[PDB]
Amino acid sequence: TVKAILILDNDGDRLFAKYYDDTYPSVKEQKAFEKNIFNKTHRTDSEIALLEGLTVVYKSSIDLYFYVIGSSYENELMLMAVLNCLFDSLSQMLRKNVEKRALLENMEGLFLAVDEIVDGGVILESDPQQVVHRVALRG
């Protein structure tokens, strides 16, 4: 189970957020959480942390920070598989430039990919090759 997927820009500003349960019901609480996460994280190719009582697996590209968040009890490799599948699906779709400019140019790609990976918090698919194939079929 995934509780959230976030992509923040280099200023910590939300490019994409999806929350799958009621942990952060208001937008003010979500944005505060996003700010806290951002301020407690840094550039990396892949890190796991407990933050805010939750398991956060995350990674950065040149100007984007990608987080996949689960409960404090979750299998953290499952959460990493989501994060890799999302990132690697984008890498294929963005011709290997995973950056704010390219991603904003194909946000539907992004939205459809996340919907192939997670459905209401349930992890449906961790192979990015599968995901990109299905996004191509849907838009």
From Swiss-Prot:
Full-protein residues shown: 12 to 150 of 177
Keyword Transport recorded: yes
Source organism, top-level taxon: Eukaryota
General function of this protein: The coatomer is a cytosolic protein complex that binds to dilysine motifs and reversibly associates with Golgi non-clathrin-coated vesicles, which further mediate biosynthetic protein transport from the ER, via the Golgi up to the trans Golgi network. Coatomer complex is required for budding from Golgi membranes, and is essential for the retrograde Golgi-to-ER transport of dilysine-tagged proteins. The zeta subunit may be involved in regulating the coat assembly and, hence, the rate of biosynthetic protein transport due to its association-dissociation properties with the coatomer complex.
Membrane topology of the entry: Peripheral membrane protein
GO biological process entries: intra-Golgi vesicle-mediated transport; intracellular protein transport; retrograde vesicle-mediated transport, Golgi to endoplasmic reticulum
Description of how the protein assembles with itself and partners: Oligomeric complex that consists of at least the alpha, beta, beta', gamma, delta, epsilon and zeta subunits.
Family the entry assigns: Belongs to the adaptor complexes small subunit family.
Membrane in keyword set: yes
One cellular component term from this protein's GO annotations in UniProt: COPI vesicle coat
Record's subcellular location: Cytoplasm; Golgi apparatus membrane; Cytoplasmic vesicle, COPI-coated vesicle membrane
Keywords: Acetylation, Cytoplasm, Cytoplasmic vesicle, ER-Golgi transport, Golgi apparatus, Membrane, Protein transport, Transport
Protein name, entry field: Coatomer subunit zeta-1
Main location: cytoplasm
